[PDB]
Amino acid sequence: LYNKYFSADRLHKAPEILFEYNKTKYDRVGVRYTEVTSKASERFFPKSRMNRAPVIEISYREGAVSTASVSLSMPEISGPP
Amino acid sequence: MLDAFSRVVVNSDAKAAYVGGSDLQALKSFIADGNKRLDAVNSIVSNASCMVSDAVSGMICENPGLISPGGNCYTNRRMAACLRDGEIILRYVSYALLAGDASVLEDRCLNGLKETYIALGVPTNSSIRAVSIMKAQAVAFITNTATERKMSFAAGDCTSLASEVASYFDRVGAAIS
Amino acid sequence: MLDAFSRVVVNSDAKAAYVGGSDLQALKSFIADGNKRLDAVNSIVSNASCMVSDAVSGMICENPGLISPGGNCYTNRRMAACLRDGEIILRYVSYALLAGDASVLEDRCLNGLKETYIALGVPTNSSIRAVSIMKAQAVAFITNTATERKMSFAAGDCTSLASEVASYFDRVGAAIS
Ligand SMILES: *C(=C)C1=C(C)[C@@H](Cc2[nH]c(/C=C3N=C(/C=C4\NC(=O)[C@H](C)[C@H]4[C@@H](*)C)C(C)=C\3CCC(=O)O)c(CCC(=O)O)c2C)NC1=O
Ligand SMILES: *[C@@H](C)[C@H]1/C(=C/C2=NC(=C\c3[nH]c(C[C@H]4NC(=O)C(C=C)=C4C)c(C)c3CCC(=O)O)/C(CCC(=O)O)=C2C)NC(=O)[C@@H]1C
Ligand SMILES: *[C@@H](C)[C@H]1/C(=C/C2=NC(=C\c3[nH]c(C[C@H]4NC(=O)C(C=C)=C4C)c(C)c3CCC(=O)O)/C(CCC(=O)O)=C2C)NC(=O)[C@@H]1C
Ligand SMILES: *[C@@H](C)[C@H]1/C(=C/C2=NC(=C\c3[nH]c(C[C@H]4NC(=O)C(C=C)=C4C)c(C)c3CCC(=O)O)/C(CCC(=O)O)=C2C)NC(=O)[C@@H]1C
Ligand SMILES: *[C@H](C)[C@H]1/C(=C/C2=NC(=C\c3[nH]c(C[C@H]4NC(=O)C(C=C)=C4C)c(C)c3CCC(=O)O)/C(CCC(=O)O)=C2C)NC(=O)[C@@H]1C
Ligand SMILES: C=CC1=C(C)[C@@H](Cc2[nH]c(/C=C3N=C(/C=C4\NC(=O)[C@H](C)[C@H]4CC)C(C)=C\3CCC(=O)O)c(CCC(=O)O)c2C)NC1=O
């Protein structure tokens, strides 16, 4: 029993803080109230980093080494069936 | 303008409110070192998920009995719950740093938390260790002295804001001790 | 160039790095055998979707219970999550090959993976088989010995790089065993 302090109507709700910042005229700061949602796996895989991996993209053609480029990114990924 | 931020929490309605232009200029004029304060808050919220997960796991690796049978992090339900509490406490502390005012954290989060923990059987000693790891993380990001990640800031001194988050974390342990 | 690639991984920001000819010559001056190392990486990432699907399909034809009711590849949601993890693992192994260093694979992918799979009920022995098929695939592409696809390279010996991908795939099984 904890219903004195944390009632089930308000239980597990916490503020959120938001930034629309780029060093631009229309930049803002935002707040909202929200329910905190999380799952047991997160100790090693926080929600900010989870399900990201390194895509590597390389461009080349035989003897055209002056044109060559390599790129790295890490978006979220969905294995194709 | 800070009363508009407080209004949201007063209503608890989950509808977003935003400030810019003259309203954000009034906020930065009203709350001390706003320019450096907003970067200090941004440094925490940009890292908040990794902070909570590392701290919560940091309390478990030092005290593995928490995840043994009958331990208070045993089973996935309790583990998701703990990681959740970590995000809830960091949330109110990040908003107390934004306001420069601990009262939101005290009134809405720490009020009754000790008795709640005792009634649930949540170990307060281990809870204080998770909070103390988040204290060290936040101080490192605010001073940009974290060894695992550098962020971008204009040059200056931010010691007061770091010593400011220090006390706000310290209030959590002081409430639950 | 190297610092930007490192900051992409450190930030986890999902924004792509891009490089000129003078930048590429600087990274190739840092890397060992970049010319052959970049063709070896290119041979994997040109085939990565075909690799993951074939490896997961192979794990299933050797263990059909994975796709029976109560099987850990049963329902489309689980099948897609399993192909997501096959691609994750293969992507991290590719970056360890580009880096000439296991640390990124160990630190961001393999640390905590065993505990997470045990907590989820993901079968680690079946995971090791899927990874072992991806090892055989990658060794074949790097040496240009694949039976159904040929790739174009300047003539020479690439046995050291093949031995290199083998060691990184073996680290995955060693972590989750
Ligand atoms: C189940 C009935 C079952 C499978 C499904 C399949 C799984 C499997 N795959 C290999 C080896 C390779 N698979 C390769 C994949 C591809 N080859 C291509 O040319 C394209 C681009 C790509 C997608 C189709 C490759 C390259 C190899 C290695 C070289 C080769 O050509 O053979 C294995 C063998 C692994 C081992 O040695 O244990 C397996 C099991 N086989 C099944 O039985
Ligand atoms: C996610 C990676 C974040 C991030 C987090 C940081 N953690 C920092 C410090 C820190 N974390 C722990 C827990 C850890 N130590 C243990 O012994 C165990 C179990 C084996 C764990 C999991 C501790 C104890 C500490 C040290 C706190 C202290 O006592 O001072 C930290 C600050 C490090 C520093 O000062 O350089 C950070 C920022 N870091 C990131 O960059 C991402 C976003
Ligand atoms: C300690 C917390 C930090 C640090 C902070 C500093 N920030 C400084 C200036 C500055 N920062 C911002 C961004 C901030 N203001 C906003 O309005 C918003 C969001 C809408 C944010 C996120 C601004 C605009 C400025 C003002 C200067 C500028 O135009 O860039 C600053 C310098 C203060 C000064 O003017 O003397 C500091 C010290 N710096 C540090 O080194 C640690 C890590
Ligand atoms: C093992 C992986 C292969 C094999 C590879 C060889 N490639 C050789 C030369 C070579 N490769 C590239 C392309 C590569 N370098 C880059 O900078 C980029 C993209 C950014 C890529 C994809 C170049 C430019 C060259 C130079 C010669 C040319 O193609 O004009 C090579 C010769 C030795 C060396 O240069 O290190 C080999 C052995 N060869 C094989 O037979 C297996 C299958
Ligand atoms: C396929 C080869 C396996 C299999 C895999 C499944 N994994 C499931 C969930 C899951 N996997 C991870 C790890 C993944 N996320 C990361 O961030 C990284 C690395 C940076 C990795 C490697 C996570 C975190 C999760 C849980 C969270 C989520 O799914 O987003 C899963 C679903 C479990 C469930 O239904 O709860 C499956 C099926 N399953 C198999 O049968 C083979 C052996
Ligand atoms: C507004 C503020 C606010 C909070 C601060 C939290 C406080 C809070 N936490 C839990 C609930 C819990 N809290 C924990 C926390 C932990 N377990 C450990 O072993 C660690 C020491 C610690 C994390 C660091 C756990 C594991 C539960 C689950 C208890 C249970 O299931 O009985 C609950 C009760 C939910 C329930 O069990 O039904 C509440 C009210 N919620 C809020 O609304």
Author numbering:
A (entry chain A): 194 to 274
B (entry chain B), C (entry chain C): 1 to 177
Direct quotes from the study:
Red algae utilise a megadalton-size light harvesting antenna called the red algal phycobilisome (PBS)—comprised of rod structures formed from stacked, hexameric protein-pigment rings emanating from a protein core that is poised above an integral membrane photosystem. Published cryo-EM maps for two red algal phycobilisomes contain clusters of unmodelled density homologous to the cryptophyte-αβ protomer. We modelled these densities, identifying a new family of scaffolding proteins related to red algal phycobilisome linker proteins that possess multiple copies of a cryptophyte-α-like domain.
We call the family of scaffolding proteins CaRSPs (CALM repeat scaffolding proteins), where each CALM domain binds a PE β, stabilising and locating it within the red algal PBS. Further inspection of the deposited maps for the P. purpureum red algal PBS revealed evidence for continuous density linking clusters of cryptophyte-like PE β subunits together; three such clusters were identified, corresponding perfectly with the three candidate CaRSP sequences that we identified from P. purpureum. Analysis of each CaRSP structure confirms that they are scaffolding proteins given that two have an anchoring domain and all CaRSPs make multiple contacts with red algal PBS rods as they weave between ‘lone’ PE β subunits.
